[PDB]
Structure formats: C-alpha cells, structure tokens
Design a protein around this ligand. Structure first.
Ligand code: 28U
Length: 287
C-alpha cells in the first residue's frame, strides 16, 4: 500500500539538550539494571528512547528532559518484558504508584522522585493517565479472548491512553513557569486537544505499524475492504484529528479568557498546548 503523505503545519522542534540528557538516561538505566544484558542494552539502544523524548519535550530544560527520558526508558523496559500473567504484572506495577522485580522497584523509586515537591492535583492526573496506559495491556489481552471483531470507537478510547501521550504531556508541566491550574488541565478544550492530539499520533503510528489492535486492521476486518482502502479511511480520521486539534487550540484561548487567570497561568497553558501541537509533527517525523 501507499503510505499517505501526512502533512502537519506545526514546526518541527527538537530539544537542544538531547546529548547530555541521553547520557543521564543511560546512567540511570545502568544504575537500575534496566538493561542487564547486552541483548537488552542493544534493544534499548535501538528503541531511540532519548530521541523520542527530545521530540516529546522539545522546549524542556535539561532537568525536565532527563526525568522524561527516565520514564520513557522505564516504559520501554516494561513493554519489552510484557491474560492472568499480564494482570499480575500490571497490578504489581500499578500498586507501586500507591506505595504498595527490578522494573517494579525502579518504577516505585522513579515515582517517589517525580512526585516529590509536585502539586497533588498534578500527581493525581499523572497517576490516572499512567495507570490508564498500564491497564491497556490487560484490556487488549481480554479482548483477544473474544471472537467478535474489535469496535473502532472503543479501540480509540483505549488507544489515546496506550500511545502514552497523556502522561507524557503531563510531564511537560515540569518545564513550564508554573503547573497548569486544575481548571485548565481538565477544561473542555484541553481535554479535546489532548484526545485529538493523542489520536493523531496514534493513528499515524498505526499506519506505519500495520497484533489485531490497529485501526487499519479493525476497519479492514469489519468492512472486508482492501488494505489500501482501510489505510485511506484511517488517513481521513487522522485529518479529522488534525482539524480537531486546530479547533481546540482556538477554543482554549476563549476558555482562558472566561477563567480570568493570572498572566503566568495563561502563558503556561498556551505553551503547553503549543507543545501538544508540536508533537504531531515530531512524532510523524519520528515515524
Ligand atoms: C508511545 C508513543 C510513540 C508516539 O510511539 C513514541 C513516544 C514514546 C514512547 C514509545 C514511550 C511511551 C509509549 C509506549 C511504550 C508505546
């Protein structure tokens, strides 16, 4: 099939601190036994975790980028090492986030470091997004036990979390002049932006990736159409997500005015939303 010529209008941004943050990431990996064999070290090298982070958080300072790369490296290792066996592994990880395996121990320590001195509303948002991400491993294994075709709408509802965007973007708040107020983080336009941006990225990933849990496959198997025809339909969905991102950004500006926020908070919210938009270009280029 012919891969669509995906176009995104937002500038392509990459973090200038990649080389230094990558050395700090690898040092943490080494310290934690997250790549305890050369096989594992080679898989880690080949995943491009560091480059991935430099595209997720292009505007971050070195300290924020470095913490973000630790999360990406950890999640790579969790993914590498992954229905009852999945539930058991996932529940042990989830437990660590509540103070309840070198990978699980690393997660609990990394969470302690991340939460320290960070506001409770942010911590709760990050945990919910991270737990939603982890739970997708169990959801998809459950669905695999069923005979019926997958529903696209339910797939997208889980895919916005399995792509990881939501918790990744939570970490972008660490580089802002202040954390988002709770009334901005979970306002209508921000939720719309977060979902559409996450789905744009994920659906582009699905096209480059095409395991049943893929929008291309789901459409093809439901309709009995050709692979190219299913791809073209996913391209239409992607364009829809783009236009939803564009709309939500405008709507966010209006909502910031309705809240009568301090200038610092308005600025932080606009910068966060520009980063969400940047990621549509960065992650397209990464794929
Ligand atoms: C994941 C989304 C992208 C878009 O494919 C890459 C970003 C970061 C990675 C993979 C770490 C977080 C997510 C997992 C392991 C799939």
């Amino acid at each position: 099939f012919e891969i669509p010529d995906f176009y995104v209008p937002f500038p392509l941004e990459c973090n200038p601190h990649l080389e230094e943050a990558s050395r700090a990431m690898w040092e943490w990996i080494d310290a934690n036994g997250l790549a305890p064999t050369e096989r594992a070290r080679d898989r880690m090298r080949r995943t491009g975790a560091d480059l991935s982070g430099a595209y997720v958080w292009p505007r971050a300072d070195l300290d924020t980028l470095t913490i973000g790369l630790k999360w990406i490296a950890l999640t790579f290792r969790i993914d590498d090492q992954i229905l009852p066996a999945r539930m058991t592994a996932i529940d042990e990880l989830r437990g660590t986030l509540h103070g309840l395996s070198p990978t699980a121990r690393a997660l609990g320590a990394l969470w302690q470091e991340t939460a320290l001195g960070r506001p409770a509303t942010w911590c709760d948002a990050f945990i919910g997004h991270f737990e939603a991400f982890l739970q997708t491993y169990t959801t998809e294994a459950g669905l695999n036990a069923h005979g019926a075709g997958l529903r696209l709408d339910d797939y997208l509802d889980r895919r916005m979390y399995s792509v990881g965007m939501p918790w990744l973007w939570d970490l972008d708040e660490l580089r802002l002049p202040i954390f988002l107020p709770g009334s901005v983080r979970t306002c209508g336009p921000m939720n719309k932006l977060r979902r559409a941006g996450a789905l744009h990225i994920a659906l582009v990933n699905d096209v480059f990736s095409v395991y049943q849990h893929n929008a291309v496959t789901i459409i093809r198997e439901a309709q009995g159409c050709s692979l190219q025809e299913a791809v073209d339909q996913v391209a239409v969905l992607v364009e829809a997500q783009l236009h939803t991102v564009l709309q939500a950004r405008q709507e966010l500006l209006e909502e910031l005015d309705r809240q009568a926020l301090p200038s610092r908070a308005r600025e932080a919210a606009v910068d966060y939303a520009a980063n969400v938009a940047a990621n549509l270009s960065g992650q397209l280029v990464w794929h």
